[PDB]
Amino acid sequence: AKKDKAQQVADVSHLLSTSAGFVIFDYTSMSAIEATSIRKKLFKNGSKIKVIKNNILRRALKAGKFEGIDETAIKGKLAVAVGVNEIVETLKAVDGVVKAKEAMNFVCGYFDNRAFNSADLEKIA
Amino acid sequence: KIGNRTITLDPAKVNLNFQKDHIAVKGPLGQIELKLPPNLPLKFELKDNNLQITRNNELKQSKIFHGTYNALITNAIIGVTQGFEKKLRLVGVGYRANVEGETLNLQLGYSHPIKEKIPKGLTVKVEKNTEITISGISKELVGQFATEVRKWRKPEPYKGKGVLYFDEVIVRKAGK
Amino acid sequence: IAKINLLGGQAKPGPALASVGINMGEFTKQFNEKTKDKQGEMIPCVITAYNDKSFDFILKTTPVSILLKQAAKLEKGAKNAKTIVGKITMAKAKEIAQYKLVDLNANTVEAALKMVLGTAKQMGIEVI
Amino acid sequence: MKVRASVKPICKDCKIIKRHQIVRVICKTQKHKQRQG
Amino acid sequence: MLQPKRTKYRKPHNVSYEGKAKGNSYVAFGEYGLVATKGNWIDARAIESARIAISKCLGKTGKMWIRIFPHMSKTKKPLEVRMGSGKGNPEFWVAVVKQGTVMFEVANIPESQMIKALTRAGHKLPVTWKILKREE
RNA sequence: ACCUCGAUGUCGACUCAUCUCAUCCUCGAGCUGAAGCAGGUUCGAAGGGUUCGGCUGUUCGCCGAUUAAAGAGAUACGUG
RNA sequence: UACUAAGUGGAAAAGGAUGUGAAAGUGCUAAAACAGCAAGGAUGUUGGCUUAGAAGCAGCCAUCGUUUAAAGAGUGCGUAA
Numbered sequence: 001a002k003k004d005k006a007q008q009v010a011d012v013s014h015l016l017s018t019s020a021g022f023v024i025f026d027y028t029s030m031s032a033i034e035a036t037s038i039r040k041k042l043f044k045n046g047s048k049i050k051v052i053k054n055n056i057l058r059r060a061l062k063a064g065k066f067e068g069i070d071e072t073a074i075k076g077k078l079a080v081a082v083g084v085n086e087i088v089e090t091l092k093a094v095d096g097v098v099k100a101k102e103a104m105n106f107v108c109g110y111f112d113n114r115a116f117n118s119a120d121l122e123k124i125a
Numbered sequence: 126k127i128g129n130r131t132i133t134l135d136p137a138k139v140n141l142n143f144q145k146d147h148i149a150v151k152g153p154l155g156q157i158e159l160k161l162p163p164n165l166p167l168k169f170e171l172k173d174n175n176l177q178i179t180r181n182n183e184l185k186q187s188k189i190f191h192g193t194y195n196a197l198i199t200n201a202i203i204g205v206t207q208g209f210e211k212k213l214r215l216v217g218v219g220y221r222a223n224v225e226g227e228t229l230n231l232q233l234g235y236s237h238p239i240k241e242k243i244p245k246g247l248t249v250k251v252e253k254n255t256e257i258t259i260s261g262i263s264k265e266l267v268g269q270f271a272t273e274v275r276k277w278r279k280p281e282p283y284k285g286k287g288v289l290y291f292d293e294v295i296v297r298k299a300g301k
Numbered sequence: 302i303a304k305i306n307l308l309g310g311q312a313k314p315g316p317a318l319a320s321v322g323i324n325m326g327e328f329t330k331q332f333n334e335k336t337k338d339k340q341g342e343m344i345p346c347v348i349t350a351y352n353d354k355s356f357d358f359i360l361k362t363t364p365v366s367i368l369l370k371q372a373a374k375l376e377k378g379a380k381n382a383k384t385i386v387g388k389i390t391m392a393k394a395k396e397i398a399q400y401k402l403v404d405l406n407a408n409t410v411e412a413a414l415k416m417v418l419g420t421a422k423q424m425g426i427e428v429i
Numbered sequence: 430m431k432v433r434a435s436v437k438p439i440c441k442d443c444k445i446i447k448r449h450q451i452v453r454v455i456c457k458t459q460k461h462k463q464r465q466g
Numbered sequence: 467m468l469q470p471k472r473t474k475y476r477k478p479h480n481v482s483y484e485g486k487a488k489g490n491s492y493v494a495f496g497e498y499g500l501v502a503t504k505g506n507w508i509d510a511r512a513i514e515s516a517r518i519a520i521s522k523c524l525g526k527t528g529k530m531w532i533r534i535f536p537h538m539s540k541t542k543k544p545l546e547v548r549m550g551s552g553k554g555n556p557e558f559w560v561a562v563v564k565q566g567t568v569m570f571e572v573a574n575i576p577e578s579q580m581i582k583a584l585t586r587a588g589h590k591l592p593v594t595w596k597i598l599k600r601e602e
Numbered sequence: 603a604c605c606u607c608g609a610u611g612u613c614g615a616c617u618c619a620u621c622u623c624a625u626c627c628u629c630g631a632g633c634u635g636a637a638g639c640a641g642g643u644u645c646g647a648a649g650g651g652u653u654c655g656g657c658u659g660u661u662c663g664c665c666g667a668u669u670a671a672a673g674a675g676a677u678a679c680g681u682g
Numbered sequence: 683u684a685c686u687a688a689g690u691g692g693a694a695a696a697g698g699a700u701g702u703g704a705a706a707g708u709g710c711u712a713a714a715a716c717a718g719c720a721a722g723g724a725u726g727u728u729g730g731c732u733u734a735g736a737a738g739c740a741g742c743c744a745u746c747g748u749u750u751a752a753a754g755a756g757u758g759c760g761u762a763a
């Protein structure tokens with residue numbers, strides 16, 4: 001209901017407030033066996049892959065007083081990849097996996113109170 | 126809903142002359158003419174690159190007309206800009222067709238020779254003896270040609286013989 | 302991709318592979334080379350059937366609930382779920398879990414623990 | 430085509446339609462064609 | 467074939483079915499019931515057909531109650547017999563169902579199966595049936 | 603037991619047929635446990651056709667040989 | 683002032699139907715509704731008796747659990763399986 005949604009938006013906003021790195025991905029053509037494989041290869045509590053609602057992600061972003069990420073979450077497939085402390089190895093790991101995949105897009109993310117572009121994601125690895 | 130669906134069209138080459146009961150659409154290909162039946166319960170408005178169909182009342186036929194002619198306008202615009210194509214897979218042991226002038230002839234399995242007249246505005250090409258492509262600017266006419274070519278040999282379910290449509294699957298039976 | 306059943310000690314036959322273009326005779330040595338540590342036991346193999354021809358194969362653990370029967374000291378479980386015959390402690394359950402951790406896709410070891418309970422409920426064996 | 434006084438779907442894919450003010454049942458399977466509803 | 471073991475009088479007057487619902491008006495043993503909407507004479511043969519049909523489509527734990535019973539008999543003069551020479555001999559037993567009497571009831575099996583079970587029971591009977599539930 | 607006992611001739615056969623469709627053949631189509639040939643069922647359709655004999659008063663019926671078929675009925679169980 | 687689209691009116695039942703109008707409740711929805719489209723739609727495993735065989739889709743022993751957004755001892759088709 002509305003109360004559960006209010007609770008949900010509050011906790012995800014808190015999680016993104018206390019976090020340090022974010023990157024957005026799409027859910028196009030990778031298997032659930034592969035999905036379980038990604039969970040085990042990360043194996044770090046700081047790194048977490050999650051399916052988030054597009055609407056809930058923007059509304060939590062408004063509560064996070066950030067800006068510029070809106071272009072990422074428009075007419076797009078949205079993932080959330082939260083990393084605590086160190087995020088470069090998580091980005092390196094996910095980059096190696098998408099290369100092992102068949103096809104994949106890759107949309108701009110958020111880290112260290114700064115935003116990046118698609119090519120800027122290529123060098124963040 | 127179809128009635129309240131945008132029909133965004135580029136003004137590059139497509140114009141739409143709205144007379145009382147004669148809609149004219151002109152573009153890259155031939156012109157398509159649509160006849161409006163009298164007392165049509167739906168008024169068009171012509172802004173820049175956007176046509177919006179509105180109705181006067183809440184009648185059943187009013188809603189039915191509002192949807193149907195939006196689709197017809199959509200279909201007319203698409204054919205004028207890029208046309209329509211249908212693909213037929215004529216498959217068999219001695220089945221083959223080819224085009225001479227205005228008549229498409231087929232030799233399916235029949236002692237009597239088979240000829241078929243092509244209507245105006247439709248072009249049918251035969252790249253391979255087992256292949257027929259009907260290209261036109263009016264959807265219903267190319268559909269009528271495709272189905273009337275099919276009527277000579279409807280695809281049977283025991284083997285693949287017949288004038289099949291492309292990417293059309295039939296239920297198979299094993300006639301031991 | 303084909304999940305094919307081949308005995309660990311006898312894997313040279315099998316005509317189905319030949320339909321895809323796999324080099325059957327060259328690959329027989331690879332099939333037999335890495336299964337000698339588990340001789341006699343039946344070990345299926347997953348085959349990445351594709352046109353690259355460098356078919357990478359992966360072995361697979363024998364199916365579960367046969368070690369449940371061995372640990373319960375009974376050949377066949379009860380034909381009715383309500384009648385409870387076999388009893389299994391946590392030590393026998395955990396040995397199976399660390400054994401079966403290789404084939405399982407669970408992140409943690411307690412998840413593998415409750416797999417033993419899950420299959421034991423199907424066998425009807427009480428978890429004590 | 431099967432002519433029956435009562436027409437009802439046989440499989441979950443059967444769909445009831447109204448053509449020419451007569452109710453018929455159409456479906457992927459041609460063995461399930463009914464009329465005279 | 468439901469039948470009274472003995473009756474005091476072999477040939478009784480027929481019992482009318484026009485009127486409201488006398489007894490057996492509310493579900494009181496099960497919680498779904500097949501109510502009638504048109505009074506008619508229905509015989510013990512129809513009960514057995516409907517009861518066998520419902521029982522076949524029942525399960526392993528469902529339980530049923532039969533309310534109506536064919537107490538009254540009816541006669542039929544033999545064919546090719548001219549009027550006179552007394553009343554005919556009793557032939558078949560019929561239960562008198564009035565508009566509003568609950569005939570069959572079901573319980574102890576999920577909801578979907580009981581509607582289907584009551585449906586097949588009512589298709590075996592001439593009266594126009596309708597489903598009712600038990601008051602809380 | 604309503605008309606007819608101051609009279610409505612009742613079976614079968616012959617001649618002439620007419621009408622209905624719940625269609626036997628011919629015509630069109632759907633499904634098939636419809637490979638082809640030959641079938642089964644249902645739907646549409648009454649324009650035409652729908653055999654000759656043995657036994658019996660026979661209708662009916664069995665049998666013989668053909669035919670695309672040897673239809674079901676009504677008309678005072680049509681027609682002195 | 684409404685209703686009917688059937689010439690119903692201007693003859694009929696058991697039964698069947700997204701015909702249409704009126705009313706009374708209840709679920710979601712611009713924190714996005716329904717349909718459709720684009721993706722995934724899992725692992726132990728193909729669980730085990732059982733059956734020549736069934737192991738996602740023969741009868742069963744029942745009618746598992748984790749990862750996870752989701753996934754069913756599966757929705758059918760179908761495969762000797």
Ligand SMILES: O=C(N[C@H](CO)[C@H](O)c1ccc([N+](=O)[O-])cc1)C(Cl)Cl
Pocket residue numbers: 609610611612
């Ligand atoms: O009397 C005759 N016919 C009467 C007329 O009242 C009537 O038509 C009739 C005919 C047949 C019949 N029968 O077959 O028993 C009885 C009466 C004739 Cl015999 Cl003249």
Ligand SMILES: [K+]
Pocket residue numbers: 606607
């Ligand atoms: K007389």
Ligand SMILES: [Mg+2]
Pocket residue numbers: 603
């Ligand atoms: Mg008399």
Ligand SMILES: [Mg+2]
Pocket residue numbers: none
């Ligand atoms: Mg009298």
Ligand SMILES: [Mg+2]
Pocket residue numbers: 605606
């Ligand atoms: Mg008279």
Ligand SMILES: [Mg+2]
Pocket residue numbers: none
């Ligand atoms: Mg006289």
Ligand SMILES: [Mg+2]
Pocket residue numbers: none
């Ligand atoms: Mg005379």
Ligand SMILES: [Mg+2]
Pocket residue numbers: none
């Ligand atoms: Mg007819």
Ligand SMILES: [Mg+2]
Pocket residue numbers: none
């Ligand atoms: Mg004529």
Ligand SMILES: [Mg+2]
Pocket residue numbers: none
């Ligand atoms: Mg003689």
Ligand SMILES: [Mg+2]
Pocket residue numbers: 679
């Ligand atoms: Mg008569």
Ligand SMILES: [Mg+2]
Pocket residue numbers: none
């Ligand atoms: Mg006569």
Ligand SMILES: [Mg+2]
Pocket residue numbers: none
């Ligand atoms: Mg006659």
Ligand SMILES: [Mg+2]
Pocket residue numbers: none
């Ligand atoms: Mg008589």
Ligand SMILES: [Mg+2]
Pocket residue numbers: none
């Ligand atoms: Mg005369």
Ligand SMILES: [Mg+2]
Pocket residue numbers: 682
């Ligand atoms: Mg005469």
